[PDB]
Amino acid sequence: GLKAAQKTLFPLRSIDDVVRLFAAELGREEPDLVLLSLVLGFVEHFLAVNRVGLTYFPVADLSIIAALYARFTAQIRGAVDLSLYPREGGVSSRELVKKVSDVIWNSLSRSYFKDRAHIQSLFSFITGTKLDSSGVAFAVVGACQALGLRDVHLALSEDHAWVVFGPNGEQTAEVTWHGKGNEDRRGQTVNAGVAERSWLYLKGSYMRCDRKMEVAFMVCAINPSIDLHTDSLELLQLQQKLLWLLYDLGHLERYPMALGNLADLEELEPTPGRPDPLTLYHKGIASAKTYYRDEHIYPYMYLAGYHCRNRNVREALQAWADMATVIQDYNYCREDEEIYKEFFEVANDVIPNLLKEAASLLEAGSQGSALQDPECFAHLLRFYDGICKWEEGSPTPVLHVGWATFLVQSLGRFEGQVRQKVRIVSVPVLTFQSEKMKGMKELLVATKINSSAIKLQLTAQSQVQMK
Numbered sequence: 211g212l213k214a215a216q217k218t219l220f221p222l223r224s225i226d227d228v229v230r231l232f233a234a235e236l237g238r239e240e241p242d243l244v245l246l247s248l249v250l251g252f253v254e255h256f257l258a259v260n261r262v263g264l265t266y267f268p269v270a271d272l273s274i275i276a277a278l279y280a281r282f283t284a285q286i287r288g289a290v291d292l293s294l295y296p297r298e299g300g301v302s303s304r305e306l307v308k309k310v311s312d313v314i315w316n317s318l319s320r321s322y323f324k325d326r327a328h329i330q331s332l333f334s335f336i337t338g339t340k341l342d343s344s345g346v347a348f349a350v351v352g353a354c355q356a357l358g359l360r361d362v363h364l365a366l367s368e369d370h371a372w373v374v375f376g377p378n379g380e381q382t383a384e385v386t387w388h389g390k391g392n393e394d395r396r397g398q399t400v401n402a403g404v405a406e407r408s409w410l411y412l413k414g415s416y417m418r419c420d421r422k423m424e425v426a427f428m429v430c431a432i433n434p435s436i437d438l439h440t441d442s443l444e445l446l447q448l449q450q451k452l453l454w455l456l457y458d459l460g461h462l463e464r465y466p467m468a469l470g471n472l473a474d475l476e477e478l479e480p481t482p483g484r485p486d487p488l489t490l491y492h493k494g495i496a497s498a499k500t501y502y503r504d505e506h507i508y509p510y511m512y513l514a515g516y517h518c519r520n521r522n523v524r525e526a527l528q529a530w531a532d533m534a535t536v537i538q539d540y541n542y543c544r545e546d547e548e549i550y551k552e553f554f555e556v557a558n559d560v561i562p563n564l565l566k567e568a569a570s571l572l573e574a575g576s577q578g579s580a581l582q583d584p585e586c587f588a589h590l591l592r593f594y595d596g597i598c599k600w601e602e603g604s605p606t607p608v609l610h611v612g613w614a615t616f617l618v619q620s621l622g623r624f625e626g627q628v629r630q631k632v633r634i635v636s637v638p639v640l641t642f643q644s645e646k647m648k649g650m651k652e653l654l655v656a657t658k659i660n661s662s663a664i665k666l667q668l669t670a671q672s673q674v675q676m677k
């Protein structure tokens with residue numbers, strides 16, 4: 211190592227002192243990822259993992275943080291001999307990146323629950339020898355910065371992390387695991403995943419972080435959870451203030467999910483004089499459109515969740531239809547199961563519950579109901595259309611009969627006279643991209659929907675029961 215100028219704000223006695231440290235580091239040529247992650251991990255430990263003795267804020271003394279920092283830089287410098295890996299042209303080699311990955315990996319405890327909270331930071335790595343999946347990727351990047359490897363940067367999809375490096379930053383390397391019961395690909399490129407058009411690799415439209423975005427990542431990685439029913443107000447405030455600092459400096463520009471996180475925090479506890487949650491959700495979508503070809507799913511997911519919490523059925527349906535319009539141009543691959551799970555839960559649990567309450571409210575005489583709005587029926591249809599189109603061409607199927615009962619129920623929440631008002635046009639008006647929905651068209655306006663025919667069309671089931 212730490213330089214004199216990095217040390218002058220210690221001790222950190224409050225949330226605002228932590229914010230000052232982040233501001234000072236963000237003003238430097240390269241913010242120190244190791245320092246910053248150790249500080250966050252330290253305060254998260256004493257605010258969420260063990261609050262014994264807490265009276266206000268866990269003071270972070272320089273002696274304590276500097277000793278943790280020294281434990282990290284000693285391990286890395288001792289285990290990675292840079293002379294074995296000459297930096298050709300002032301950039302890093304694949305072998306060096308895989309060395310650093312191995313040093314982090316091999317340090318980890320032999321057995322632990324990888325799903326646990328509060329194992330994301332370098333504090334966890336040093337004091338518990340535990341990291342979560344993306345935590346390992348972050349740690350590799352922090353280690354490379356500590357070694358002077360300016361070209362190694364964090365790469366992020368919506369469900370995975372790796373690194374970029376090398377000439378023009380054009381190389382990719384896996385540095386951590388993905389999911390459970392997948393085989394390690396550490397050291398390899400991500401090109402096969404890009405080429406197969408999986409969601410996991412975002413068709414190549416993944417985030418390539420600079421150092422400031424790596425700071426944003428560790429701030430998003432703060433976990434305020436104390437338990438299933440309790441969050442640390444202190445950590446919520448810290449994360450919120452840090453995200454506003456990053457926002458003001460321009461470092462959330464290219465980070466859609468961070469904008470959604472900030473919107474969620476503002477919904478919980480609004481900051482006076484700041485943009486409303488909707489504004490922020492829409493900025494997150496705009497970031498995805500601008501920098502990532504509109505190939506990201508979660509910006510719409512964050513927006514839909516806000517509308518669903520506020521029981522705004524219309525706008526929730528629109529955002530989930532928009533969700534589906536992105537997924538339709540992907541192939542559903544091995545290792546995409548997390549996004550399948552989210553679409554499944556929206557289709558088969560969230561939408562049904564939202565429409566069930568809308569039906570009860572309509573019975574009690576609600577006006578302007580989504581259930582009497584043909585544009586809302588069109589959004590529901592567009593949601594299913596995008597899921598059906600996603601499945602086309604995919605190496606693994608999406609739909610099955612366990613989806614069909616919920617489709618029939620949801621369709622039936624709209625009366626036939628509402629459903630009749632949507633005009634399905636071929637290449638309120640809607641065009642279908644999927645063959646499954648094109649063949650379902652003439653079932654969609656009957657007063658009583660033909661449940662059996664819908665199931666056949668959605669699952670492309672060939673036959674009915676013999677007897």
Ligand SMILES: CNc1nc(NC2CCN(Cc3ccc4c(cc(C#N)n4C[C@H](C)N4CCN(S(C)(=O)=O)CC4)c3C)CC2)c2cc(CC(F)(F)F)sc2n1
Nearest residue numbers: 344367368369370371430467468471511514515518519555
């Ligand atoms: C912030 N930066 C960041 N975040 C990353 N991942 C986050 C992505 C969002 N999730 C929270 C989450 C989860 C599910 C969500 C939603 C929103 C919806 C909807 N609809 N849905 C669907 C589910 C079914 N429901 C619907 C109903 N709502 S409700 C009751 O509130 O109405 C609850 C959620 C959200 C916000 C948190 C984690 C990642 C991931 C990265 C990759 C890697 F590898 F690094 F980890 S980087 C990153 N950055």
